[PDB]
Amino acid sequence: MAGTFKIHAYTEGGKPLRTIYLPKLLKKVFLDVVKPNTKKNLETCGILCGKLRQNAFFITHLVIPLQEATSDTCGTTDEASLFEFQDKHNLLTLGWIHTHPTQTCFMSSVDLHTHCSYQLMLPEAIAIVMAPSKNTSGIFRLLDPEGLQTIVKCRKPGLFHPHEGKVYTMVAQPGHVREINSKLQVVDLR
Ligand SMILES: [Zn+2]
Ligand SMILES: [Zn+2]
């Protein structure tokens, strides 16, 4: 009908990307759940989990794993329990979301290395970054193959370090991510 369209989304390398359906509620619900950390200027992450149905992914569960909260990272500390939870409930990893309580909306060095594993496993994988002090948010991915290659090769120690060239980009509007009016379940493993 009116205001509808078909999308064919491609990576930089020309690979077709399947659609990910994102609940309209997810961003705001996530900010609600992790507010105690945000008020302390501490980052929190959640994993975007779901299922593949008729050639498209549906995010159904926002899973908050055990993690180490700092002012500039929120790395998962117990991947075993996260994996066990996802396996038991047949939930795929589709991406992740995290806060920048006071920072601008961008992808940090750590964020790019974190995302690399997601997007190697699933070309469609996304990183949602909420920057509530700026009232902004963004959905990002690495360039594929070029950015994935840069991060795979990067051995710089040091929490925050620069990268040579363009490495990441915001998901286009419209593009392979579509919002839908769906229910949401938050699963907190903490
Ligand atoms: Zn970040
Ligand atoms: Zn690096």
> How many angstroms separate the alpha carbon of residue 65 from the centre of ligand 2?
24
154 Cα: distance to centroid of ligand 2 (angstroms) = 5
Q: How far, in Å, is the centroid of ligand 2 from the Cα of 151?
A: 6
DSSP 103: S
Strand intervals (E) in the chain = 9-10, 16-17, 20-23, 45-53, 56-64, 92-99, 126-131, 136-142, 168-170, 177-180, 185-188
100 is in an annotated binding site: yes
Dihedral sign (CA 83, 88, 89, 92): positive
Q: How far is the CA of 11 from the centre of ligand 2 (A)?
A: 21
The parent domain of residue 150 ranges over 1-190
Please tell me whether residue 140 adopts helix, strand or coil conformation: strand
Q: Which ligand is located closest to the Cα atom of residue 128?
A: 1
Instruction: Confirm whether residue 78 is marked as ligand binding.
Output: no
Instruction: Identify which ligand lies nearest to the alpha carbon of 97.
Output: 1
Domain count, the chain: 1
CATH code of the domain containing 176: 3.40.140.10
Ligand of minimum distance to the alpha carbon of 161: 2
The coordinates were experimentally obtained by: X-ray
Whether 163 has a binding-site annotation, put simply, is yes
Query: What DSSP state is assigned to residue 31?
Result: H
Alpha-carbon span 159 to 57, nearest angstrom: 32
* Span from the CA of 40 to the centroid of ligand 2 (angstroms): 27
Q: Can you give the resolution of this entry in Å? A: 1.8
Q: How far is the C-alpha of 174 from the C-alpha of 142, rounded, in Å?
A: 17
- Is 113 known as a binding-site position? yes
* Ligand with minimal distance to 43 CA: 1
Three-state helix/strand/coil letters over 16-30: EECCEEEECCHHHHH
110 contact partners, CB below 8 Å, separation of at least 6: 72, 73, 75, 159, 160
- Give the C-alpha separation, 136 to 115, whole Å: 20
Closest ligand (CA of 156): 2
